[PDB]
Amino acid sequence: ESVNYDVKTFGSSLPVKVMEALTLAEVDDQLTINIDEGGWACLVCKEKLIIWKIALSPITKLSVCKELQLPPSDFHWSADLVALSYSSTQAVAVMVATREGSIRYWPSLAGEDTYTEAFVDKTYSFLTAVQGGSFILSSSGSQLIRLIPESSGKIHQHILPQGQGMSDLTLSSVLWDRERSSFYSLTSSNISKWELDDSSEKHAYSWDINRALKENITDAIWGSESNYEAIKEGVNIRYLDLKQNCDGLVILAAAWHSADNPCLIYYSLITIEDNGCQMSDAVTVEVTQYNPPFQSEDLILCQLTVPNFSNQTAYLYNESAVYVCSTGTGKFSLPQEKIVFNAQGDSVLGAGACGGVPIIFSRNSGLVSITSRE
């Protein structure tokens, strides 16, 4: 088994529709899943979206599972481009976008044949439900667009202030912080933050984090090497993911030095405070155990999940494993472990959190939580 963690089925038996899709899916098949903080999951499977309420209870009359027809695309559809919006199955509205910018909206998951459409050199990476029952569609070049369904049936759209898109402004991730009505984007060179209301956004800041964290990053990895000064100017750093916890913002960054022998990739969690519109002096870099050999830059894939805002614990995951890591001082952090989901065709198709519980959706075992044994 795992040493410090139980990894077991979370929730009740999956919906029949999900079962099929999984049992039918072949390791050629790309499956992606959006596991939503609200308690609902979306499985993007070939040309449909199956959406279901994660059933913490086994009871049938509580059971909800809907299948929605996706808007045609030549590209694979992506659960990163599917977002749920809840008022307060009727409560649940749904929006999907394609890589080219086609939008399909359902005001209610109850009415599956009822939806409205719209459209936005552009590739779209994420769609995120934000406040006022609206969404932000983010492009790979980081043009950010607000999309707001109107009761008429139209979908209003506008670009965010200073968010025209494309310095390299390639987008890595966005983060929506509901309690503070804040939307952030992490690009290859900076972090930007907007403050929203139900219909607009005000640009709060853009930090050049490459300038800020660079030395902290190289210093935490190669800093004690006899030849640190020579080393550092050749270091490559890529910022990959952005989450938050009570310590503030948590950034996942990969760093490497071509000329190292053996050349490994170091993955670090960087925590900084978001206080006002400027950075503090206090940056903590925590180098994780996930330290694979460098192969190619296209192959540097790794995502971050932070289920519990307050223990200082992060899960890095790729398609084959999940690494339980700690951030911050590590005082309250769980034991550091690697959990393998690589065996017998198995794979990590997605991850998220349900009620502050780390949830993984595995090809062989469905939804699974990772909970400490102590």
Count the alpha carbons within 13 Å of 224 in the hemisphere toward its beta carbon: 2
Token digits of residue 334? 């769980």
- In 3D, which of 353, 327, 329, 351 has the Cα closest to residue 339? 351
Q: Do residues 157 and 120 make contact, with C-beta atoms less than 8 angstroms apart?
A: yes
Q: Do residues 100 and 115 make contact, with C-beta atoms less than 8 angstroms apart?
A: no
Name the maximum alpha-carbon separation found in the chain. Answer: 67
- Number of CB atoms found within 10 A of residue 203's CB: 14
Token digits of residue 344? 């017998």
C-alpha to C-alpha distance for 288 and 285, rounded to whole angstroms: 10
- Number of CB atoms found within 10 A of residue 63's CB: 14
Spell out the SS3 assignment of the chain.
CCCCEEEEECCCCCCHHHHHHHHHCCCCCCEEEEECCCCEEEEEECCEEEEEECCCCCCHHHCCEEEEECCCCCCCCCHHHEEEEECCCCCEEEEEECCCCEEEEECCCCCCCCCEEEECCCCEEEEEEECCCEEEEEECCCCEEEEEECCCCCEEEEECCCCCCCCCCCEEEEEEECCCCEEEEEECCEEEEEEECCCCEEEEEEEEHHHHHHHHHHHHHHCCCCCHHHHHCCCEEEEEEEEEECCEEEEEEEEECCCCCCCECEEEEEEECCECCECCCCEEEEECCCCCECCCHHHCCCEEECCCCCCCEEEEECCCEEEEEECCCCCCCCCCEEEECCHHHCCEEEEEEECCEEEEEECCCEEEEEEECC
Spell out the SS3 assignment of 306-361.
CCCCCCCEEEEECCCEEEEEECCCCCCCCCCEEEECCHHHCCEEEEEEECCEEEEE
C-alpha to C-alpha distance for 44 and 67, rounded to whole angstroms: 10
C-alpha to C-alpha distance for 355 and 137, rounded to whole angstroms: 26
Cis peptide before 262 (omega within 30 of 0): yes
C-alpha to C-alpha distance for 341 and 316, rounded to whole angstroms: 13
N residues, the chain: 374
- Number of CB atoms found within 10 A of residue 1's CB: 8
Q: In what order do the strands lie in the sheet with 248-256?
A: 236-245, 248-256, 266-272, 283-287
Enumerate the domain spans of the chain: 1-374
Distances (CA, A) of 256 to 200, 235, 236, 287, 293: 40, 6, 5, 12, 10
- Number of CB atoms found within 10 A of residue 243's CB: 23
Fold of 1-374: Methylamine Dehydrogenase; Chain H (2.130.10)
For CA atoms 198, 201, 205, 207, the dihedral sign is positive
C-alpha to C-alpha distance for 144 and 121, rounded to whole angstroms: 15
- Number of CB atoms found within 10 A of residue 165's CB: 18
Token digits of residue 287? 């180098």
Burial of 132 (0-12, 13-18, 19+ CB in 10 A): middle
C-alpha to C-alpha distance for 359 and 146, rounded to whole angstroms: 29
Q: What are phi and psi of 209, to 5 degrees?
A: -80, -25
Q: Do residues 63 and 15 make contact, with C-beta atoms less than 8 angstroms apart?
A: yes
Q: Do residues 220 and 255 make contact, with C-beta atoms less than 8 angstroms apart?
A: no
- Number of CB atoms found within 10 A of residue 14's CB: 22
Buried b (16+ CB within 10 A) or exposed e, 272-289: bebeeeebeeebbbbebe
C-alpha to C-alpha distance for 335 and 373, rounded to whole angstroms: 10
Which amino acid belongs to residue 187? T
Q: Do residues 287 and 307 make contact, with C-beta atoms less than 8 angstroms apart?
A: no
Count the alpha carbons within 13 Å of 234 in the hemisphere toward its beta carbon: 11
Q: Do residues 64 and 85 make contact, with C-beta atoms less than 8 angstroms apart?
A: no
Solving technique: X-ray
- In 3D, which of 212, 314, 302 has the Cα closest to residue 256? 302
The resolution in Å comes to 2.3
Distances (CA, A) of 111 to 53, 106, 147: 16, 8, 20
